[model samples]
Target chain A: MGVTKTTTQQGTGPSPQVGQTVVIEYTGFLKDTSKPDNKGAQFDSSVGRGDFETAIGVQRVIKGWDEGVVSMKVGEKATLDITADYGYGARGFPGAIPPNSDLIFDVYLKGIK
Target chain B: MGVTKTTTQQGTGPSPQVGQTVVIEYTGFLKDTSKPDNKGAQFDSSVGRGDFETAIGVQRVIKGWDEGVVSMKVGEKATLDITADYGYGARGFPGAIPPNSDLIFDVYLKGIK
Candidate 1:
């Protein structure tokens, strides 16, 4: 339903600078397929910036995101592969996610700070 | 981690008045247990009211909520049972829910209009 491109980067971009606000468009998927499990089909929100204070640091996000955001630049895009330990984990978020499953996310970095 | 109560109401309240905004606290669960899969642990948003315009009618929400809000009056609360046919359906919502499953929600209607 959107753009499809093949690129060189194997995983997510560099981590975002701490305190930088990021505008992103993302689609999350189970590790096995390219189909989106969930998509930001609507609008993207700014993260790290003061606009959305709900997500600011590693403590407020899943482990994969904590590691993934570091590589991002203001306009770069990349896909992230997250292991269970870094994703939802064994506790199994009940109806949301199964136990020990891997996840994937396609992230588009719109801006930082 | 929170309050637990057993009561007589079997399903959610009346369809909220067509344009009246309603403030509510809610918890959603898989039908097999009472534990919440997701709880509005933070603030409850107003539906129908001009305060939050994202949700105005059934077109913007899951089927269960469409039917559930009908019986409610200001300050009433109730629980709703949603079959898969009336919920996310066979699409399964991938990582969020399994196919053909039933869902339960405890809804608290703080105010209407």
Candidate 2:
């Protein structure tokens, strides 16, 4: 029913409520089991260039991110296993993400406001 | 030499350092004297769409934004007067902003990371 969230590192502070802005570093990948940690090939990242900032639970990003991110506290690191329904869906993201592709995202909750 | 920042509201908490991510809401305008408050015609906004997130003082945005935003703390609101040197320079953003244009931005700093 919802995306899977596996916490590799626990964070402190209160979790962000809906409609609040959150800043994060993320690396997204297509689903693959043969790759390292089953993370597959990296499709997108918000490291080096800058962390990504978005509002959680307001559909600013994919449904998976909203659901998964809202459950985390600041400084937490987690991996999200998202099914197609919770992701870009049938249309996907065009060039980067394939259509109906199941996605995996390693996310770090840097801060929330 | 630098963008002029006029603080309309003071913010609390620590100001974001260079390379730190910050979330904010903003409205951009082309310079105009006939408009209300001299804000001119509105061009871009991050109100209903969602707050924008970026790393400050790192060229992620225009030089004016980096210089101006870095001076603000969380929960502050400020207006920035940006000359062409700190804006798009000679190549300006096509369509939305004319070449060598001076711009005005009303910004609210929501959070810092």
What is the Å distance of residue B32 in model 2 from its true position?
19
- Lowest lDDT 10-mer window, candidate 2 chain B? B90-99
Clashing pairs in 2: none
**Model 1 stretches astray by more than 4 angstroms:** A4-113, B1-15, B33-56
Which candidate leads in lDDT? 2
Best by DockQ: 1
Instruction: For candidate 1, write residues B1-113 as lDDT tens digits.
Output: 01223333443444466545555666666566444543322212333333322232433445566556656554556767777777655543423455566766667665555
How far off is residue B18 in model 1, in Å? 2.5
- Please report how far candidate 1 places residue B69 from its true position, in Å: 0.9
Mind giving the per-residue lDDT tens digits that candidate 2 earns over B1-113? 55898899999977988999999999888877777766776767887878877778887678889999999999999999888788755534223455577889999999986
Interface RMSD of each: 15.0, 16.5
TM-score of each: 0.41, 0.50
Give the runs in model 2 whose Cα sits over 4 Å from its true position: B1-113
